[PDB]
C-alpha cells in the first residue's frame, strides 16, 4: 500500500509533480536512489543555478535564512515541497507521507521499486540534449557521503546479483518441472489458454 520509486533516470520536476500529486491524495510514496535523478541542460547550467540559490541568504542573520540542503534526497524533498501547500495543515500532513533516501536503504533494498515513464529521461528528453546527474551536482556543492553511498550501493548490487541468480535458477527449474508433468495438467492448461492465458 506504499509506493516505492527508483530515482535513477527520472527528471527532477517531472517526478516531483507526480509524487506531490499522489502524496496529496493520501498515498504513501517512498523515493529511493535520489543520486540517480538528472536535470535537463548541461552540468554548468544547473551548477550555476544551485550556486545562485546558495547566494540567497538573510543579510542580517543567515541562521534564519534559507536552508540550503546539500544531499540529493533533501534537494528532491525541497523541490517536492515547492509543489505543495506546506503552509497549511493539509500540506504538512501530506508532506509527512513522503519519504526520500540517498541510495537504497536496507528497509527497501528487498522490495520491488516502480518507475514512472512520464518522468524518465529516455522518454521526455531528446537523445541529443545534455543532462546533469544530481549526485555529481550535490557532491560539488557540499555533499559529503558520495563515496560511502557508492560503496554501499556496490555491495547491495552484489547481494542483488546473488538473489537474481537464485531467482533465475528457481524459474528455470519451474519451467523444466512444468514440462515434466505436462501430461497431468493438459486439461488445466487447455482451459487456461482458452480464456487468454499462456498464449
Amino acid at each position: 500500500q506504499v509506493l516505492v520509486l527508483d530515482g535513477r533516470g527520472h527528471l527532477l520536476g517531472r517526478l516531483a509533480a507526480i509524487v506531490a500529486k499522489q502524496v496529496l491524495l493520501g498515498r504513501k510514496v517512498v523515493v529511493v536512489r535520489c543520486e540517480g535523478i538528472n536535470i535537463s541542460g548541461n552540468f554548468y547550467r544547473n551548477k550555476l543555478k544551485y550556486l545562485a540559490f546558495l547566494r540567497k541568504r538573510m543579510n542580517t542573520n543567515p541562521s534564519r535564512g534559507p536552508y540550503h540542503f546539500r544531499a540529493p534526497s533533501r534537494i528532491f524533498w525541497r523541490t517536492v515541497r515547492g509543489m505543495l501547500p506546506h503552509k497549511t495543515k493539509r500540506g504538512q500532513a501530506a508532506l509527512d507521507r513522503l519519504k526520500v533516501f540517498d541510495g537504497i536503504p536496507p528497509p527497501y533494498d528487498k522490495k520491488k521499486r516502480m518507475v514512472v515513464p512520464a518522468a524518465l529521461k529516455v522518454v521526455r528528453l531528446k537523445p541529443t540534449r545534455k543532462f546533469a546527474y544530481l549526485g555529481r551536482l550535490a557532491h560539488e556543492v557540499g555533499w559529503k557521503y558520495q563515496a560511502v553511498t557508492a560503496t554501499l550501493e556496490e555491495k547491495r548490487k552484489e547481494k542483488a546479483k546473488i538473489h537474481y541468480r537464485k531467482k533465475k535458477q528457481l524459474m528455470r527449474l519451474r519451467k523444466q518441472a512444468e514440462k515434466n508433468v505436462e501430461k497431468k495438467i493438459d486439461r488445466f492448461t487447455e482451459v487456461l489458454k482458452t480464456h487468454g492465458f499462456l498464449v
Binding site: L24, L25, G26, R90, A94
Partner: protein, 109 residues
C-alpha cells in the same frame, strides 16, 4: 464475505481558484482515468464511513461507533475519471485524501 464497494478518494470540493462550493464533492475512483469509464459509476451510491467517541444505532446489529454520510454520483469531472458526488450533508473536509466507498447497487446493467 468480501469487499463489495469500489475504492475512491475525496480529492476535494467543487471549486474555482478562489471560490469553493462545499455542496458538491470531487471523487477519485481507483482504476478510472478517462471520461469514458465513468458511465458505469453514474448514479452509484457512495458513503463516507467514520468512527466517533459516542455509540450510535446500527441497522441489523448492536450499537457501534461507526457513522456514515450517504451520497450519490452525479456526473463525471474533466477527462480524468474524476466524479462529482452530492451527499445529504457536506463532507467534513477532514476526509480530504481519505477513503470513500462507492457502492454497487443502484444497478442498471
Amino acid at each position: 464475505s468480501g469487499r463489495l464497494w469500489c475504492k475512491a478518494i475525496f480529492a476535494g470540493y467543487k471549486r474555482g481558484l478562489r471560490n469553493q462550493r462545499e455542496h458538491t464533492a470531487l471523487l477519485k475512483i481507483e482504476g478510472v482515468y478517462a471520461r469514458d469509464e465513468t458511465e458505469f459509476y453514474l448514479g452509484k451510491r457512495c458513503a463516507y464511513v467514520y468512527k466517533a467517541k459516542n455509540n450510535t444505532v446500527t441497522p441489523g446489529g448492536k450499537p457501534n461507533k461507526t457513522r456514515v454520510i450517504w451520497g450519490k454520483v452525479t456526473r463525471a469531472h474533466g477527462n480524468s475519471g474524476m466524479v462529482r458526488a452530492k451527499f445529504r450533508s457536506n463532507l467534513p473536509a477532514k476526509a480530504i485524501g481519505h477513503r470513500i466507498r462507492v457502492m454497487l447497487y443502484p444497478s442498471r446493467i
